[PDB]
Amino acid sequence: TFKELLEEVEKLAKQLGYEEAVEAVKKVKNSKSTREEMQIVVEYLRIDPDNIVLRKLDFAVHLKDQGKEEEAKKVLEKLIEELKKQLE
Amino acid sequence: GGTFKELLEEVEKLAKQLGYEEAVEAVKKVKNSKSTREEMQIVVEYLRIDPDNIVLRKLDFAVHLKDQGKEEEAKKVLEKLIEELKKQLE
Ligand SMILES: [Zn+2]
């Protein structure tokens, strides 16, 4: 699921020491709507504009906002793969 | 240098001069948009094509801010982007 993929992202970014990213993913994972998800993304984009997790999370939430949930999840699967490859 | 749209016109001209063709067309489309919902629709289609383009990234953020009714902070983002583009140009 989207939230399950978010949880894996959060674990990998945590293992990588991305604490701002961890905070935003966790808050998006616990959001009640796409509006709130996107509000969270915007706040963290302000704090860390170059962060690869934030940038991919932004694009995925955009896709979820459009009802393109499968593509949104494919974005996170690719982010998970990138995080893993930095880690192994 | 004034409204959101004029700032967008200036981004569009500098990005054109630098040769950012995708970002030029996105900014042109955002500028001619009827709603923040349309503006965001355009940003997303162009983020898919070129996710690392600096103009697209700042445009996305400015449109978010406009979406939240923070029009003045959105203009400030574009003003910072215009400053950066003018730096790489001269
Ligand atoms: Zn965005």
For A1, the 3-state DSSP assignment is coil
Structure tokens at A83: 């995080």
Half-sphere exposure of B40 (CA within 13 A, CB side): 19
Q: Residue B16: CB partners within 8 Å, gap ≥ 6?
A: B24
- CB contacts < 8 A, A to B, total 27
Question: Would you say the C-alpha torsion B60, B65, B66, B72 has a positive or negative sign?
Answer: negative
DSSP A88: -
C-beta atoms of A49 and B57 within 8 A:
yes
**Alpha-carbon A72 to chain mean position:** 10
Chain A residues with a Cβ under 8 Å from any Cβ in chain B: 38-39, 41-42, 45-46, 49, 55, 58-59, 62-63, 65-66
The whole-angstrom distance between B10's CA and the closest CA on chain A is 22
Q: Quote the CA–CA distance of B56 and B44 in Å, as a whole number.
A: 9
C-beta atoms of B57 and A59 within 8 A:
no
3-state secondary structure string, chain B? CCCHHHHHHHHHHHHHHHCCHHHHHHHHHHHCCCCHHHHHHHHHHHHHHCCCCHHHHHHHHHHHHHHCCCHHHHHHHHHHHHHHHHHHHC
Q: What is the CA radius of gyration of chain B?
A: 12
Q: Residue B49: CB partners within 8 Å, gap ≥ 6?
A: B22
C-beta atoms of A59 and B44 within 8 A:
yes
Q: What is the CA radius of gyration of chain A?
A: 12
Nearest CA in chain A to B65: A42
Q: How far is the CA of A66 from the centre of ligand 1 (A)?
A: 12
Question: With contact defined as beta carbons under 8 Å apart, do A29 and A3 qualify?
Answer: yes
- Give chain A's length: 88
3-state secondary structure string, A7-70? HHHHHHHHHCCCHHHHHHHHHHHCCCCHHHHHHHHHHHHHHCCCCHHHHHHHHHHHHHHCCCHH
Listed resolution, Å: 2.0
A35-43 contacts: CB < 8 A, separation 24 or more?
Answer: A37/A61, A37/A64, A37/A65, A38/A62, A38/A65, A38/B64, A39/B68, A41/B64, A42/B61, A42/B64, A42/B65, A42/B68
Q: Residue B6: CB partners within 8 Å, gap ≥ 6?
A: none
In Å, what is the CA distance from A50 to each residue of A45, A47, B6? 8, 9, 26
Structure tokens at A11: 């674990």
Q: In chain B, what is the straight-line distance between the N-terminal and C-terminal CA atoms, in Å? A: 18
Q: Quote the CA–CA distance of A82 and A53 in Å, as a whole number.
A: 10
C-beta atoms of A42 and B57 within 8 A:
no
C-beta atoms of B51 and A66 within 8 A:
no
